[PDB]
């Protein structure tokens, strides 16, 4: 009584994969067959299901219109067609027989690793500053590699609005940006200061580098 | 100096949607025009780029071949045809004028939301247990809803291995499990006991409900 799984590997975003399990030692035709995945360092989560070539296929929402479950009863094989793969699809995939009141998932595949992957990293600290108006705000943005030409820029976002430009070229202020907003740093230690805080200033602040053709963003520090 | 965005809305997986920025107030036929996007709760992330007639056109890895950026200079318009849309494409979409050393992303569209759209919750405690052999262990699993037919199983998973069925239908110890393992409880309070810890029992333990059409798993308990 066993399921032999096959497939997986490294792909680039937007690629395709197929998985498979062949069942040995039980009645594939009456079993329900499910798929279940575990992201690295995480727990288990269900992907898709199919019954007795019923067919009556069921899919988790994350994978809808991208993934496709199918079975070949004559070949005792379950499949999972995986299209337009996203980084978020990275995980160990298992096939499992569903026994219901008679075993739950009693037969498991061993697991195959499906990894999706393809650069300057911006790291803001802290994630959160609780300050009061008038107080100073000092946001760090540290780069994994030196930002040439000091092509680093800060934006501000207020909920439901587009982002607003603040500093560009490290320390150059934008069209209509108050002087309490200061940008400084060079190379990889950039730092935005708000010398005293205004009530409107309470928002999320992102940093941005355009020193290459792959533009990147920090995660935002939030100010409260 | 303006970008007037239009388009978007709610679509089902595999749907189609074209966006539009109409340019006013500058020499549009010569500007570098980008598209940027923010998925709800997350931060900014670049999407696409277009510039003069002898320039390249750039797409983020996760969109290539589905989205198509274009432009009608004669009508001062930027487009983004989006095809084969999927949940992970759910986000607010912005157009922006790129200024580089002269200001980076210095003009934006207001943004339009694009949403692509077509459960019992198990909670384990404690999350970690450091014990020595001979001691007894006690692992909880609570169900947000009530598990019908007490259709709740327990699995063991060791370092990098598929999981192993321990208990099912609440209390049924699977063929081959030491009798120091017992599962008990019903409704929403299930609990599994390991009465004399052998060293080989040290691993992670999951729980699972198959009562409904959307199976679910607890987070796991680590026993050390």
Residue numbers in the entry:
A (entry chain B), B (entry chain A): 1 to 118, 124 to 229
The authors write:
Diabodies are among the smallest of these bispecific antibodies. They are constructed by connecting heavy-chain variable fragments (VH) and light-chain variable fragments (VL) with short “GGGGS” peptide linkers. Therefore, the two VH-linker-VL chains associate to form a dimer with two antigen binding sites, each consisting of the VH and VL fragments from the different chains. In order to investigate the structural flexibility of the Fv interfaces of diabodies, we have determined the crystal structures of 10 mono- and bi-specific diabodies with and without bound antigens.
In monospecific diabodies, two identical VH-VL protein chains form a homo dimer. In order to confirm this, we determined the structures of six additional monospecific- and bi-specific diabodies with amino acid substitutions at position 83. We determined the structures of three monospecific and three bispecific diabodies by substituting the arginine at position 83 with other amino acids. Note that the diabodies we used had substantial sequential diversity in their C”D and EF loops. The second Fv domains of all the diabodies are clustered in a small area, demonstrating that substitution of the positively charged arginine greatly reduces the structural diversity of diabodies. In conclusion, we have found that substitution of the positively charged arginine in the EF loop greatly reduces the ambiguity in predicting diabody structure.
